[PDB]
Amino acid sequence: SQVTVAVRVRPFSKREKTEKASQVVFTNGEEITVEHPDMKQVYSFIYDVSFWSFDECHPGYASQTTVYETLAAPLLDRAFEGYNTCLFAYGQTGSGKSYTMMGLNEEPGIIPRFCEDLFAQIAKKQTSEVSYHLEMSFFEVYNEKIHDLLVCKGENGQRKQPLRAREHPVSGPYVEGLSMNVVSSYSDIQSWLELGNKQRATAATGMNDKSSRSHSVFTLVMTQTKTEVVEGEEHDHRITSRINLVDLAGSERCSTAHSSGQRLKEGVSINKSLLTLGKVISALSEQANGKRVFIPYRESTLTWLLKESLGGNSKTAMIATVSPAASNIEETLSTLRYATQARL
Amino acid sequence: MREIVHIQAGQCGNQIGAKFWEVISDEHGIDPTGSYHGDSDLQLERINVYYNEATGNKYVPRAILVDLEPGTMDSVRSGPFGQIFRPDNFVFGQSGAGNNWAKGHYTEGAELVDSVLDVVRKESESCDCLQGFQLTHSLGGGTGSGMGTLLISKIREEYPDRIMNTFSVMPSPKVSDTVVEPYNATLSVHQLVENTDETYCIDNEALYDICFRTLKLTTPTYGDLNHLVSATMSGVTTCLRFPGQLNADLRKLAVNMVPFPRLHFFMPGFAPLTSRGSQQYRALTVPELTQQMFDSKNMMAACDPRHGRYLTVAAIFRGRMSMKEVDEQMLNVQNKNSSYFVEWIPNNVKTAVCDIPPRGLKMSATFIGNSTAIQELFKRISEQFTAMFRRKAFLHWYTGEGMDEMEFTEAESNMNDLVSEYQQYQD
Amino acid sequence: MRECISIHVGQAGVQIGNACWELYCLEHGIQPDGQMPSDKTIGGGDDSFNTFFSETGAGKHVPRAVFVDLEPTVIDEVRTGTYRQLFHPEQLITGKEDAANNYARGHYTIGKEIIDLVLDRIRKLADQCTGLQGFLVFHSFGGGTGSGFTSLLMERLSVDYGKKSKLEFSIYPAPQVSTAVVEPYNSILTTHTTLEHSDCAFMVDNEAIYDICRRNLDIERPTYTNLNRLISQIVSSITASLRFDGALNVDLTEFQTNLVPYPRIHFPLATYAPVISAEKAYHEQLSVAEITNACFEPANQMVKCDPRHGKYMACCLLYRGDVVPKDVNAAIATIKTKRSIQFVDWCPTGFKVGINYQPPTVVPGGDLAKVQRAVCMLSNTTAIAEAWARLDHKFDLMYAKRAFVHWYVGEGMEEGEFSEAREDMAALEKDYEEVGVDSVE
Ligand SMILES: CC(=O)O[C@H]1C(=O)[C@@]2(C)[C@H]([C@H](OC(=O)c3ccccc3)[C@]3(O)C[C@H](OC(=O)[C@H](O)[C@@H](NC(=O)c4ccccc4)c4ccccc4)C(C)=C1C3(C)C)[C@]1(OC(C)=O)CO[C@@H]1C[C@@H]2O
Ligand SMILES: Nc1nc2c(ncn2[C@@H]2O[C@H](COP(=O)(O)OP(=O)(O)OP(=O)(O)O)[C@@H](O)[C@H]2O)c(=O)[nH]1
Ligand SMILES: Nc1nc2c(ncn2[C@@H]2O[C@H](COP(=O)(O)OP(=O)(O)O)[C@@H](O)[C@H]2O)c(=O)[nH]1
Ligand SMILES: Nc1ncnc2c1ncn2[C@@H]1O[C@H](COP(=O)(O)OP(=O)(O)O)[C@@H](O)[C@H]1O
Ligand SMILES: [Mg+2]
């Protein structure tokens, strides 16, 4: 039960290239400094992993292959071992999060590499005796209420059913009424994810207008039928593995952003949720050292749905996208301090 | 102005509220005909917190009554202080709960909760600014557990921003006036901790012991017991009605006394309390009251705090007194008895003072405490529950009314997780 | 021609105001109805001085202040009390709901819906003023109103007005004594924002005045009325040169000019040395020497902070009554001869002096005695860093378990505004250290 926290600094965009915006964050190997332009002082942050993607020729540059091969493939092999995995993702609008997990049509992220390497290893490991079968799911959390995204809504005030979570004693928590759909190639995943992210809830306070106001979990349950009892050869014990990949929303200060009504609730819940997650992550990094603590999964929905993917003999990974400009100096600080507390 | 809506369910809630109003009216100068016959003018400045106005200087309380057998509402009507209530708020039905949490939550409670919310919306929309709700119900039973928790679930959706307390009468270890106490209490805790802000766990063993040892009474009936719960209820909302040197309200206490949201079950207490004979030999001062408050033979929780640690404590005083005495005494408590207070909260205490004491006393005090020892009050039920649930003793009266076994294991695991949460801060 | 607008936030603010304005009404002869018999007796004078009290054509005098609490229980004692005919009925009784001892609720959620009225009334008051110099705010750390609404109001005022003094008499939390678990968080979040706006932020501590009462005045069971009167005496000693005629006048542009070396270290301490009763009012000479020696005496300070654990950067001494500068020169030389009182190596002067002729007034139903002379001292030290560190340790104990945070983020706050304030307050503690270092060649 070890959780790894990482960071990836994005390189300058064309706009902030032209405006000659100032660089505030620098790298010394595994330490990352943030320097207020020259104002008074600088803060220094340390993480288990650090990806300096600011310009191409720096040593320690982090191509997408490096991000996958360092963060994800351990999740793959630990899943084939038979255990479960949870990958997180945090970053405010304009940090390089969509480029990271999904990517572009010529610059892959984490998800396509994950699925493609998965099906390749399956189809080469598939035998006359062994077999495999995968099933997906994709849902969201909005104001501590669950919603499924694979459904094609009609026309209504809202075709968003607030499903309820339950606690089966053996398997643990689950969602009542969750659409689970089979998969054997990655295109079948794209066909669902495009629809889902089209059905994801988004809103505009005054900033970038298409900003997510909800959490989104993409889960894959994978089965191993390796086991054939030679006494009669009809099926026996069987392994199952859960792989959760969750895209979160931003902290969002509610004062600088003079918000009202539904734009406040949407933000309050997200703040609460992230805090709960923080405590969990912290406690697990305090749990590996060998102490006695309590992991409060029940103070949030996202944690209660994922009690079994984090705790126990499972793996967890967190990556935090940050922008190096000077305009976005408060947001980056928030992100880095969040991930630091996730480290300790 | 702030405004409380007082819901009350079951025999316990009816019989507690009928005394609570009997006291608030005395404090504010109201008579059982609704009329005002007081002396002081501060009794009317903030009468909008509990009462509403009417034509001939009448004052009708904002009380809602949600039983399911008329046998008790008739006793309130056919009583001393029954006429002041609004007859359109005496909600009731028939086909009683049979002391079953199922009937009061799914079958014979869903058929009536709408008629209750119809009154709640009337009495809430008619307010300048509501602060929150209140409730008085008994776990272990039926109606008060089921319909109460259902109304909580339905009020927390409409009014999430506002406050929702519950003066809950928890079961007792030794005595048991009902045989299905555990199964109902567990399912009520499963629906309270997610949907409450500050509840006050009460146990009748503690009140019998208070009535026997301290007040030195030989024939304590439930009227003499609820006479204490009324006092606590009144003390919580004193600084919301009367002035003070350092005022307070419900939200202040809920902020100071709830470090984490799942931990809002409090042990209450009231001081002074003396036998009629022994009132000539006691000095009415702050330290005597503090001694009586932090003693374990006055808390209503039926739970020894010395077996745990005080996460947070609140003291609401009433009378012309000093602000040095309170601070000094509370610091002395934090320092001497440090083993009963956490260390990652340096000051585990707070204070409120009102300048207006009760009708017959020169000083009064009220005590609220969040203590880890409360796990004993649930660790017991989880023994009674599972022993009965290991082989499904009285369960066919619950399934047959539209339930399933998973709904029991849910509540069991939640209650146990709460135990483990309060144990984290014990050693 | 010499005006100062007072602002009162919270229970602490309003009660300090009910003391201060009683005092000011007594000094100037104003009755609680706002009238004056003296000006109709002889026909002259400006005893009801235009620094604090306005005037209209009916010989009435209204104060230049405004109250606000976000809770109606307090102001409704003023509206329904002995001083009801004095205040303009525009007192903010916005008693929908209180802050619940939460900075987040007195900054964004409930802190709006009031603030615009406050700004309107302050403009209405300033437009009635000619030569305004000051905005004396009285608030209290620990509370939600005094922590949040004060910060927001000062944010707005540093834009609307700008090159105007904005002082602050706050109730700083005690090291042991306190009336809430959430005192630290609110304090550390207030000092982070009320450091770039304010110009001089005085500070007191109720533990110190409690110690003063049972050792100077001989009161073993005091109450807040016995403390806010001393605070009113402080403010009167501060705001007397604008009212009464004296030798060495000292306005508000001089306190901020001779006690703030650098713009971040403007947190001084106060003392009012004669706190004796009418019995001990006799048996004692009460000369300038005794008093000035009492100001630098621990156990007579108003913040629990031993200055011998630090150094003095500057100190202003404002005297009242029968005083001659010869005695002040003597006493300053005496204090500079001593060795327990360390002054920095970059301030040999280290002394501003102010003298006035009007002695203090005696409030009936009071505790203090009549005296022919009185004194206030305001002193900047490097020692008050100790209290900041004490509070920061409590912060760092609770914020690690992430206790009491969900009540804040449930009211419009993220988790980063905390760590932005503990790292902003962990630099001022370093500044007060750097200033304490003797220079080197
Ligand atoms: C002169 C004197 O002190 O006599 C007391 C008295 O003997 C004592 C014992 C009173 C008495 O209380 C009881 O008799 C009692 C009996 C059973 C269970 C609980 C109490 C008293 O009735 C209580 C009564 O005080 C009050 O009534 C309070 O205002 C109380 N009033 C009511 O509850 C009330 C009930 C029904 C109708 C109208 C008012 C109250 C307490 C808290 C908040 C609001 C009101 C007074 C002076 C006394 C007597 C009369 C003996 C005490 O009452 C309280 C709650 O403080 C019980 O111990 C205290 C201390 C008093 O000394
Ligand atoms: N010296 C002095 N301190 C006071 C007085 N009243 C309150 N305080 C202090 O102020 C602290 C908290 O402030 P509050 O009394 O809650 O007033 P507030 O700032 O408006 O807080 P809220 O009412 O909740 O918004 C208390 O802990 C007291 O220590 C007073 O009259 N005199
Ligand atoms: N304190 C108090 N407890 C009561 C009273 N009447 C019943 N009880 C308790 O309530 C429990 C049974 O609850 P019940 O009255 O059946 O609630 P209901 O199911 O809603 O009617 C028992 O454990 C009793 O001890 C009362 O008047 N006062
Ligand atoms: N490692 C990288 N190399 C080059 N460009 C990047 C990298 N990471 C992010 N970017 C740029 O940053 C932008 C991120 O925009 P967007 O996808 O809206 O971020 P987010 O998904 O966090 O809102 C992309 O246009 C992309 O070109
Ligand atoms: Mg207040």
Author numbering:
A (entry chain K): 392 to 735
B (entry chain B): 1 to 427
C (entry chain A): 1 to 441
Reproduce passages from the article.
KIF14 is a microtubule-based motor protein with essential roles during cell division. KIF14 belongs to the kinesin-3 family of motor proteins. As all kinesins, KIF14 possesses a highly conserved catalytic motor or head domain that contains nucleotide and microtubule binding sites, and where ATP hydrolysis is coupled to the generation of mechanical work. Here we report the near-atomic resolution structures of twenty KIF14-microtubule complexes corresponding to five distinct KIF14 constructs in four nucleotide conditions mimicking four key steps of the ATP hydrolysis cycle.
Construct K748 includes 13 neck-linker residues and no part of the CC1 domain. All the KIF14 microtubule-bound structures in the ADP or Apo states are very similar with the motor domain adjusting to the open conformation. Comparing the microtubule-bound and microtubule-unbound structures of KIF14 in the same ADP-bound nucleotide state also reveals a displacement between the tubulin interacting regions. KIF14 helix-6 (KH6) moves relative to helix-4 (KH4), and KIF14 loops 8 and 12 (KL8, KL12). The displacement between these areas causes a movement between other regions of the KIF14 motor domain that to a first approximation can be described as a relative rotation between two subdomains within the KIF14 head, a plus-subdomain that includes regions that interact with the microtubule toward the plus end, and a minus subdomain that includes regions that interact with the microtubule toward the minus end. From the KIF14 microtubule-unbound to the microtubule-bound structure, the distance between the switch loops and the P-loop increases and there is a large displacement in the position of KH0 relative to the microtubule and the switch loops. These structural rearrangements disrupt interactions between the ADP phosphate groups, the switch regions, and the P-loop providing an explanation for the acceleration of product release associated with kinesin microtubule binding. We also propose that the open nucleotide conformation and the large displacement of KH0 relative to the plus subdomain facilitates the incorporation of ATP into the nucleotide-binding pocket and the exchange of ADP for ATP. In the ADP structures, the density at the tip of SW1 is relatively weak indicating higher mobility in this area compared to the tip of SW2. Densities connecting the side chains of the highly conserved Arg in SW1 and Glu in SW2 (KIF14 R604 and E643), indicative of the formation of a salt bridge between these residues, are resolved in the kinesin-microtubule complexes.
